Design a protein around this ligand. Structure first.
Ligand SMILES: C[S@@+](CC[C@H](N)C(=O)[O-])C[C@H]1O[C@@H](n2cnc3c(N)ncnc32)[C@H](O)[C@@H]1O
Length: 259
């Protein structure tokens, strides 16, 4: 009853109107217990929690996805590869995380796929605007891109972008802490995701790595003593499980390829 109330307020006329209901409800429940039953404060907690796991990386108000697509259409409808790339870089820049990787985008994916097999299916979890890269990924023509995140509009825009790029795909609104990860997929990307999962649920990071049905997994961490912190814990945790891993560092991103 009080959860629906919190949800209604979270239909945030601002930053959170389209966040996955599964996510709002999970955060709202814990917020209510933490708030001693007080809805207003529970609403505050939920919002602050949403900002930490999602809002912090996006604009104060919904991105102008219509303009971004417009520009993409112009490039594609003109058959100009340069314009398409430009329109994709501009779009990705709206999301803080993808923005951080753009300065080393080509190097990042060129190197990454040298340590991965040719994928039949690529899964991108907590994807953000990363799927807009890919023309940079040199994927086999038939590869199906499966992308998911916690906001319907963001994911919807990713779907439209992939459609314009003629990339076989399937997009969903999924919360890594609840939704299933049993679908088969050759490679799964978990770029700059673990730190956020840890903040929401201790130990969930490696739990996801453990259950995700993929023999190849990429886990990255942002480095901008951040490198120190992330590399030390992940590696000790990997060595504890005897996970075969290969480490790389491109741009401000620590990279681990898990087989
Ligand atoms: C630091 S970003 C990285 C985004 C993208 N993978 C990239 O590297 O360019 C974090 C993303 O994780 C996502 N996220 C946070 N919590 C999530 C959850 N519980 N389930 C799925 N995605 C989540 C957010 O929506 C946010 O886009």
């Amino acid at each position: 009853d009080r959860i629906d109330e919190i949800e209604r307020a979270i239909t945030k006329s601002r930053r959170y109107q389209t966040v996955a209901p599964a996510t709002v409800r999970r955060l709202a429940r814990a917020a209510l217990v933490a708030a001693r039953g007080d809805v207003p404060d529970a609403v505050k907690r939920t919002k602050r929690g949403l900002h930490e796991i999602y809002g912090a990386f996006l604009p104060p108000s919904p991105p102008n996805y219509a303009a971004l697509l417009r520009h993409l259409d112009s490039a594609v409808d003109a058959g100009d590869d340069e314009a398409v790339r430009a329109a994709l870089l501009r779009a990705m820049s709206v999301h803080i995380s993808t923005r951080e990787r753009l300065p080393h985008l080509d190097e990042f994916y060129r190197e990454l796929f040298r340590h991965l097999p040719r994928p039949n299916t690529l899964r991108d979890l907590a994807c953000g605007l990363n799927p807009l890269a890919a023309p940079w990924m040199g994927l086999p023509a038939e590869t199906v891109y499966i992308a998911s995140d916690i906001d319907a509009r963001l994911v919807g825009f990713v779907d439209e972008a992939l459609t314009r790029l003629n990339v076989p795909h399937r997009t969903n609104v999924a919360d890594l802490l609840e939704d299933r990860l049993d679908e088969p997929a050759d490679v799964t990307l978990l770029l700059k995701t673990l730190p956020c999962l840890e903040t929401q649920q201790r130990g969930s990071g490696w739990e996801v790595i453990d259950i995700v049905n993929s023999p190849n997994i990429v886990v990255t961490f942002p480095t901008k003593g951040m490198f120190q912190n992330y590399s030390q814990s992940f590696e000790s945790q990997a060595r504890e499980r005897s996970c075969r891993i290969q480490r790389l560092e491109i741009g401000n991103e620590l990279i681990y390829v898990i087989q």
